[PDB]
Design a protein around this ligand. Structure first.
Ligand SMILES: Nc1ccc(C(=O)c2ccc(-c3ccc(S(N)(=O)=O)cc3)cc2)cc1
Ligand SMILES: [Zn+2]
Length: 261
C-alpha cells in the first residue's frame, strides 16, 4: 500500500475510492443503515461468545486513517465465536471511527441515526492461518461493531485516551500492553448481523459484521481527545483526524438478522 493515496478528504474521500478500488461498488459493501423494523429475528442464531480474558495488547498505532490497538494473535487468545459464526475468530486489533461533531462519526447507522463514533474489534478466522490469508476469503473476518454516544465517561477507555498524545501523527506508535478490551463492551450482547466488507480500502468483501444494539457511553472530553489526533505525519500541515467514517452503502441483495426479538 506504499502507493495508496485514499483518505477522507474532499479529493480522496469515500466518493473517490472506487477508482483505485472498484469493489467499492460491489454487492456486499459496508457500512450499511440498519433498518430495525426490517431486520428479522433469527431464532437459529446462537449466543455470541466473546472471550477476552487472555487478550494481550502490544502496541497502539496512528496509521493516518485511525489508531489501532494491536494484539498478539500468535496464540489462541481473545476469541470471538458463536452467534452467526462457524469456527473461531482471533482478535488482532481494534480501532474507532469518529466525527468532527457529536452528531456524526459512526459508519453503521440505526434507522438513519448516526452515533458519535463506532468501535471495531477485528477478528480473523483461524481456519485460514493468518490475517493476510483470511481477508482473501468471504468468511475470513468477523468485526464486532459497538456504537459510542456522548454522555458519561467510559472508565475502560481512559488508558487509550491518555496515550493518544504520544501518537499524534501518522506513523507514530507506542507500547500499549495489558489493555483489557472487556472494558469497552456494553452490558448486552444483543446484535444485528449481515455479510459485508472492510469499510476502508481495500474494501474486501470478507467480513461477517456483528453490530451490538447497545451503545457504550463516553464523555465529551474523551471523544475530544480523539479529535486532536492528526491524519498527517509529523512536520506536515496539520489536518485534524476527524470524520474518518465511510457513509452507509447500498444493502442490495442482503438481509440483516437480529439476535433478539
Ligand atoms: N492481502 C491483504 C493483506 C493485508 C491487508 C491489510 O493490511 C489490511 C488493512 C486494513 C484492513 C482493514 C481491517 C478492518 C477494517 S474495518 N473498518 O472494516 O473494521 C478496515 C480495513 C484489513 C487488512 C490487506 C490485504
Ligand atoms: Zn473500522
Amino acid at each position: 500500500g506504499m502507493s495508496h493515496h485514499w483518505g477522507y478528504g474532499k479529493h480522496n474521500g469515500p466518493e473517490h475510492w472506487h477508482k483505485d478500488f472498484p469493489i467499492a461498488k460491489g454487492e456486499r459493501q459496508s457500512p450499511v443503515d440498519i433498518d430495525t423494523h426490517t431486520a428479522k429475528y433469527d431464532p437459529s442464531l446462537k449466543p455470541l461468545s466473546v472471550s477476552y480474558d487472555q487478550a494481550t495488547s502490544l502496541r497502539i498505532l496512528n496509521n493516518g486513517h485511525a489508531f489501532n490497538v494491536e494484539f498478539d494473535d500468535s496464540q489462541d487468545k481473545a476469541v470471538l465465536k458463536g452467534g452467526p459464526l462457524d469456527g473461531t475468530y482471533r482478535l488482532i486489533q481494534f480501532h474507532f471511527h469518529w466525527g468532527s461533531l457529536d452528531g456524526q462519526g459512526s459508519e453503521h447507522t440505526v434507522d438513519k441515526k448516526k452515533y458519535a463514533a463506532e468501535l471495531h474489534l477485528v477478528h480473523w478466522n483461524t481456519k485460514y492461518g493468518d490475517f493476510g490469508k483470511a481477508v482473501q476469503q468471504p468468511d475470513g473476518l468477523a468485526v464486532l461493531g459497538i456504537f459510542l454516544k456522548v454522555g458519561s465517561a467510559k472508565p475502560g477507555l481512559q488508558k487509550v485516551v491518555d496515550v493518544l498524545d504520544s501518537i499524534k501523527t501518522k506513523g507514530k506508535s507506542a507500547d500499549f500492553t495489558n489493555f483489557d478490551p472487556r472494558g469497552l463492551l456494553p452490558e448486552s450482547l444483543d446484535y444485528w448481523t449481515y455479510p459485508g466488507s472492510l469499510t476502508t480500502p481495500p474494501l474486501l468483501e470478507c467480513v461477517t459484521w456483528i453490530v451490538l444494539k447497545e451503545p457504550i457511553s463516553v464523555s465529551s472530553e474523551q471523544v475530544l481527545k480523539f479529535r486532536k489526533l492528526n491524519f498527517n505525519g509529523e512536520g506536515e500541515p496539520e489536518e485534524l483526524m476527524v470524520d474518518n467514517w465511510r457513509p452507509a452503502q447500498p444493502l442490495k441483495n442482503r438481509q440483516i438478522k437480529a439476535s433478539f426479538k
